[PDB]
Amino acid sequence: NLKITNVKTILTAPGGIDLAVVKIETNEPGLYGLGCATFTQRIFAVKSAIDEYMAPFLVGKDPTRIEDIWQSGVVSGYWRNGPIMNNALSGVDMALWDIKGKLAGMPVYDLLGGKCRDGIPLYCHTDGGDEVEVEDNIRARMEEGYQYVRCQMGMIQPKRSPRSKTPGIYFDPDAYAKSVPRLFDHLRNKLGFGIEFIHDVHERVTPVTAINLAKTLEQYQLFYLEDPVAPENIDWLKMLRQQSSTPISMGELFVNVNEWKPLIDNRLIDYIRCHVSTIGGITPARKLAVYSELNGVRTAWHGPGDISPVGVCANMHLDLSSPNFGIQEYTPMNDALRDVFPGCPEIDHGYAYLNDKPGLGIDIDEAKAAKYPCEGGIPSWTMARTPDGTASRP
Amino acid sequence: NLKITNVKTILTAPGGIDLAVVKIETNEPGLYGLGCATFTQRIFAVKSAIDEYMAPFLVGKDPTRIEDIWQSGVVSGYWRNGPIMNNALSGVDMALWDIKGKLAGMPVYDLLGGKCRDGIPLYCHTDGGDEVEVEDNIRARMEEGYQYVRCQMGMNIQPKRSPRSKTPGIYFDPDAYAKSVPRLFDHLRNKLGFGIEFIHDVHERVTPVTAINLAKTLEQYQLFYLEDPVAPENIDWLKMLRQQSSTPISMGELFVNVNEWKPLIDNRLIDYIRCHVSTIGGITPARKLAVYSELNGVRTAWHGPGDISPVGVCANMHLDLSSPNFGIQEYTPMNDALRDVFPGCPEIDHGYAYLNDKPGLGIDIDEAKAAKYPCEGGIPSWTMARTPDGTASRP
Ligand SMILES: [Cl-]
Ligand SMILES: [Cl-]
Ligand SMILES: [Cl-]
Ligand SMILES: [Cl-]
Ligand SMILES: [Cl-]
Ligand SMILES: [Cl-]
Ligand SMILES: [Cl-]
């Protein structure tokens, strides 16, 4: 006779980044589930979608029917397949998985097939102001035990702009593209080939530029080259895959089956990068991991700062239960996040270790969460402009 | 600290058909899991594979690691992807899912995402000696509540005369057959109308272009599906079929290899997948296939003949209840002995199956009762199929 009684959205920013967490309560005393709905740049719109529409959709329903709730909820507004819509669904979906694990007395990874590895290998970012900082940051991370690192340019000369400039964060894609191989030549000379390197193109250059970059980086044996094209340009990956053998990852921006499915169907990528909440939670991410598995494509779920610890846990339960796990991107959490969210995964020398508590093994202290209210506002970095002032995909 | 302590193969034939059921015991008293390993025609070789090789692979391992056991077990002999190999894995895989469900206090369908429908629609066979017997069988099954039926010729155009001597076999005329099917369906639609859903199984009996022409001729009769229009060895003909016909197609009870179903589902060349769950290696792979099918809009139609244990029957149905893209469940009525040996058989009520809500697969086996029906072995006569000139044909 188990029923959903309450659905609320908790907005909190313990790490200085707006988060959304869905709590589903039931008619069984002390039984609730948590899920992540973090699309940080539209957090208030996500809250609106959950509070106004998902809440009346769910109250009175049997929470054990995860798939039925997903399939019906996904179409409940007719229109669908978007980042705000998918996050609203994810909050619910992950919470239901959390409830199912609690009822079963097992971690979500055990519901999904049990452990497929002994730890979850991580990669971290090495963001620096210039090349020497980046290199030292890599060395510091390798000392901490990281065996996979993202390497970017520091935060040839850029082109001169026109005589007036429309405000934005200016970037020179051609200067960038011509400079990346030099960076990796230097890093491989200094650090060797044992360490795994990731580089994120992050949709910043024209497609043929990305393809040429992929070819020029083959000799440096990257673990992957990430987002060489925008999702609007996935139709360029066929050409890239006729020419380059640099491993490719795509997908943190994906919100639609018609973005990832042609890529995985045609083996045009080697790693899938979706932000789990932004494709709708554990239910659809699990199916995607499986679809990827049968095509020899591996998982690399998005692991930035703009994911709640509930979402971090969701990534990692998928990770532990997938034979085709590739890598887990990881952004270190501060003490406030660990305090607000007891049960954060244990980070030890480049590997993550999940506790073996039931469901997602994570909780939220609502009183503590309330101490860190959301900021809102609009990010500056998404107003990217090329030297002539053209608004570009960031 | 849960461990597998014993793996055994129970061989029993309460329905007069050889079955293999794996029982996996643990170091927790009373906790065990059951799985189907029924490839009936090779049952003793399935037992040999499990007892000699799977049992020592598993003893002492943590049974909660289903996927790790599947992934390591599938490659434990290096060579893989076959009906005997896959059935040995399925016995184990299904038993482990049973164990996981028992441990969780929940049916396997609930582990897999919960109920996606309120009952499982079935189809049954209407096997008859001639056309009127088949038509009466359809009426009888419609009276019982079946809303979907398989319709075949009686077990017309005269068959071809054979050469002056004949090599023994079960003779069949594929051209007489193919020219007669549309007439059968014209008659059945004239008498019974279009509300009843019809399935027809080609069962790999004709050349591919014959099957393509037959699919086209049967369009007007609106079949729920036309089944196995080609052999697995001829799946490269389905592209041409799908350029021309819109009759829904099912394929796959013979499949044992990812390279059989994957190009078909990748290119949407079928509408239903028909694999025998144990024969592709269990719930673990069948679930993956159901999901791969879902994203391609392909629906499930797991094989449900007599040569499947009640444990396999339940495994099909736990998959069925938890798949959004469930299509249909073929169902073969069971006898008293099967029900007696295997307590927990699903409720069959007016064309729907209703699983009990017990943990695991909700099925058990009585080993003392099972021992009363020893397996027979031997060779089926029907698989020695020959065309009129005596050519050995795919049955
Ligand atoms: Cl949206
Ligand atoms: Cl960069
Ligand atoms: Cl992307
Ligand atoms: Cl074999
Ligand atoms: Cl029949
Ligand atoms: Cl029939
Ligand atoms: Cl027939």
Brief synopsis:
The structure is a homodimer. Chain A folds into two domains: 1-107 and 357-394, Enolase-like, domain 1, CATH 3.30.390.10; 108-356, TIM Barrel, CATH 3.20.20. Chain A is 37% helix and 15% strand.
Into which percent range does the helicity of residues of chain A fall? Answer: 25-40%
The CATH topology of the largest domain in chain A is TIM Barrel
Radius of gyration of chain A: 21 Å
> Are any ligands bound, and if so which?
chloride ion
Question: What amount of the residues of chain A lies in strands?
Answer: 15-25%
Whole-number count of domains of chain A = 2
Multimeric status of the protein? homodimer
- Helix-strand sequence of chain A: EEEHHHHEHEEHEHEHEHEHEHEHEEHEE
- Let me know the largest β-sheet of chain A: 10 strands, mixed
How far apart the termini of chain A lie comes to 49 Å
CATH class category label of the largest domain in chain A? Alpha Beta
- Known CATH architecture of the largest domain in chain A: Alpha-Beta Barrel
CATH superfamily of the largest domain in chain A: Enolase-like C-terminal domain
SS field, number of helical segments of chain A: 13
Greatest contact between two chains: A-B, 29 and 29 residues
Q: Shape of chain A, please?
A: globular
PDB class: lyase
Keywords: enolase, lyase, Structural Genomics
Assembly: dimeric
Entry title: Crystal structure of gluconate dehydratase (TARGET EFI-501679) from Salmonella enterica subsp. enterica serovar Enteritidis str. P125109
